[PDB]
Point group: D2
Chain length 121, copies 4
Amino acid sequence: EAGITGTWYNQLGSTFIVTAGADGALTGTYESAVGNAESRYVLTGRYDSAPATDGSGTALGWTVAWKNNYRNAHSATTWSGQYVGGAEARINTQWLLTSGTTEANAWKSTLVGHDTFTKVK
Amino acid sequence: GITGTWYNQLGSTFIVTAGADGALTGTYESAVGNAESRYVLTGRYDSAPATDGSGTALGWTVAWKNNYRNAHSATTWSGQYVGGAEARINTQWLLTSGTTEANAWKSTLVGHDTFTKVKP
Amino acid sequence: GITGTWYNQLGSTFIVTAGADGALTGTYESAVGNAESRYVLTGRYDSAPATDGSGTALGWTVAWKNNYRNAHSATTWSGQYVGGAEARINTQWLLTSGTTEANAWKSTLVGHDTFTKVKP
Amino acid sequence: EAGITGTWYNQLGSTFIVTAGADGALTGTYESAVGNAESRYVLTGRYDSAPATDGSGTALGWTVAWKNNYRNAHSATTWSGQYVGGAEARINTQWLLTSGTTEANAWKSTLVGHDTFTKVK
Ligand SMILES: O=C(O)CCCC[C@@H]1SC[C@@H]2NC(=O)N[C@@H]21
Ligand SMILES: O=C(O)CCCC[C@@H]1SC[C@@H]2NC(=O)N[C@@H]21
Ligand SMILES: O=C(O)CCCC[C@@H]1SC[C@@H]2NC(=O)N[C@@H]21
Ligand SMILES: O=C(O)CCCC[C@@H]1SC[C@@H]2NC(=O)N[C@@H]21
């Protein structure tokens, strides 16, 4: 929550600005350094608002649909991962990027990858 | 349309509203796993899909905490809606559990769910 | 058993021999993608599965180069064999294309294939 | 081929010993630092034996079934990725680890992750 809330950057140079709400909500904006994308996009997600206290990360995920008021890529990414708190906080993720496709092309609709986010100030 | 009550091959129930500008908001009830009753979900979808026959890209997240249980985990589904006589949402998902750093290699399950509006 | 000729939901043909000590060896012919004719495959399976009803874990790889084409890519399938009257192999797969470093983020497709011995 | 052939170690401390054959074969052994595993396991896979020369990686993949003459985990991992050659050669991968399960448990059969291998000498 204060931990998650803030500005984060990944290894590609993308920017993630997020607010973690007391109810488990994540809201913010995402700017991707790569792909069919420009400017900021809405993100929404959820996190474990009462995580384990036993040295485990805090599970979370969020989605961006790659449509904003400037571009539409007809695609959406979800990130699933965990926040690791502390003075060098990290969010470690795997992601799935699905493009809208025709039925015949659905087998090649989804890319998979991994992003590591570092918190800035 | 996307709005409605959906069921996957496990018998889970996905109740969702698609807002006009791209929001997905609803609840998820899983038939399996460390889960009971409904959980909050939020996500996004392409609110102006292509007009060539392509599906509508979407995704959503559930954190597996509600008033009954907390599994200290979260699932994201990424996929596309395919309209038509038997509308479908085809997805792949990632379920990440909170882990220690040394166990992070085994933190994330992957799978695939297909949803229709047909009730079991 | 695992040995035989299998077909997935795309109509691809997977011909495989399961060696007694865990080898998988065969050929794969994809119905889709940058592919024509048969490609070599190799993999491994659990040659002494559990005796509790569980499936048999397995995986295999195809590099998409043969005498006809080279897509500069490789797919791995990871999954389990489920015996019975209608034997099945349920898999998830990763298709990695060779890319530059800057494009590595978009190098890998993920999907899921289910195989049976029923010919289209 | 000479490039791929050798000993490699990942971020977990696992050991990958591989030979790349002229026909596109990969053969060798894998020792995992983690999980239900001990000693070396057979691996087999394939690689693009005539890759692009345009600054792209060489696509490859391999499988380990986690049975050897000392332990059986009833599971198998596949790694899919690319070799990036040069004086600091790397193999960058994503992987899928499937466990044998009952039908009711099949939804939780498969773990996903990513490993980066560094070549040693
Ligand atoms: O090309 C598209 O369809 C839209 C942009 C997708 C960019 C992705 S999302 C996963 C990865 N992480 C990033 O920061 N950018 C890419
Ligand atoms: O066990 C947990 O950590 C929480 C429940 C997870 C259930 C999952 S989410 C992906 C899959 N699809 C479902 O409908 N249920 C399972
Ligand atoms: O286009 C390529 O790079 C080579 C062909 C890939 C075809 C894939 S592999 C996963 C999926 N299952 C199949 O039977 N065919 C596609
Ligand atoms: O626990 C098991 O079922 C067997 C061992 C699996 C270990 C895996 S494979 C992917 C990852 N990379 C490694 O080097 N070790 C783990």
